[PDB]
Amino acid sequence: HMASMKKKGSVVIVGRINLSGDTAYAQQTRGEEGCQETSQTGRDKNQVEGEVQIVSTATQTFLATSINGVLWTVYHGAGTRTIASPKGPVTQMYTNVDKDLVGWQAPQGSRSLTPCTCGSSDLYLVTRHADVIPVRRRGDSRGSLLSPRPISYLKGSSGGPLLCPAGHAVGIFRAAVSTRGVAKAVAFIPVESLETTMR
Numbered sequence: 265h266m267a268s269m270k271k272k273g274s275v276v277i278v279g280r281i282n283l284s285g286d287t288a289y290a291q292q293t294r295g296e297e298g299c300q301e302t303s304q305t306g307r308d309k310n311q312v313e314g315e316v317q318i319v320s321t322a323t324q325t326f327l328a329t330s331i332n333g334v335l336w337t338v339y340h341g342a343g344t345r346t347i348a349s350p351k352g353p354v355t356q357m358y359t360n361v362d363k364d365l366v367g368w369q370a371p372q373g374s375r376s377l378t379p380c381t382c383g384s385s386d387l388y389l390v391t392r393h394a395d396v397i398p399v400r401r402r403g404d405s406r407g408s409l410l411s412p413r414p415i416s417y418l419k420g421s422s423g424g425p426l427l428c429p430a431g432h433a434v435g436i437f438r439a440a441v442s443t444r445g446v447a448k449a450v451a452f453i454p455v456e457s458l459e460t461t462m463r
């Protein structure tokens with residue numbers, strides 16, 4: 265309406281969780297200054313690698329996971345925002361507030377996880393600190409931590425994957441179930457729900 269109205273920035277990839285070796289570890293690929301500038305321009309010329317990205321807006325940081333050629337994350341992190349890319353902002357390909365789910369085309373250079381068809385309930389949650397947390401699946405969209413810990417340790421990991429023993433994607437971490445600040449269970453978007461959304 266006004267000549268003063270501002271536009272929200274793009275989501276920016278600022279790092280990744282490295283899962284390629286024997287040791288999981290977080291890597292930062294962009295610092296806060298370049299992140300702020302890239303959010304405004306939407307132009308990110310940095311090379312993207314791997315499956316799990318660390319992403320940030322001006323106000324939040326969380327994770328994003330490539331499965332089947334789509335970079336997925338949570339709506340409560342990304343809203344309807346574009347993601348920065350070498351050629352400018354990229355509009356979401358999937359948006360579903362009812363699932364807390366959004367998706368963009370996976371970045372050039374990323375690797376995608378394969379959707380799990382194992383039917384296994386022994387899962388592993390990957391956090392933004394590269395902790396690999398055993399989680400027993402307890403329903404279509406819930407799992408229990410085998411070793412509970414304060415919600416602090418899970419904050420910022422929405423958008424991260426739950427994996428099966430074979431390293432396939434089983435879901436996208438959405439929310440934590442807490443008792444007196446201790447995370448006992450997690451909610452996630454099952455990969456079948458992503459596979460449906462893709463149709």
Ligand SMILES: COc1ccc2nc(C)c(O[C@@H]3C[C@H]4C(=O)N[C@]5(C(=O)NS(=O)(=O)C6(C)CC6)C[C@H]5/C=C\CCCCC[C@H](NC(=O)OCC5(C(F)(F)F)CC5)C(=O)N4C3)nc2c1
Pocket residue numbers: 324325326327339340341361362363364415416418419420421422437438439440441442450451
């Ligand atoms: C606006 O449009 C939408 C549409 C759909 C939608 N859907 C949601 C389920 C939702 O929930 C909110 C965000 C999420 C969260 O914090 N997500 C992280 C995370 O890390 N975020 S993040 O990266 O820090 C951040 C904020 C940058 C992006 C993984 C958590 C980690 C720690 C928990 C912190 C305390 C919070 C504990 C809380 N618990 C819970 O609500 O339980 C409910 C429930 C459940 F089953 F769990 F769903 C019925 C029992 C929780 O987890 N919330 C609250 N907001 C929305 C909003």
Ligand SMILES: [Zn+2]
Pocket residue numbers: 379380381382383384428429430431432
């Ligand atoms: Zn599997």
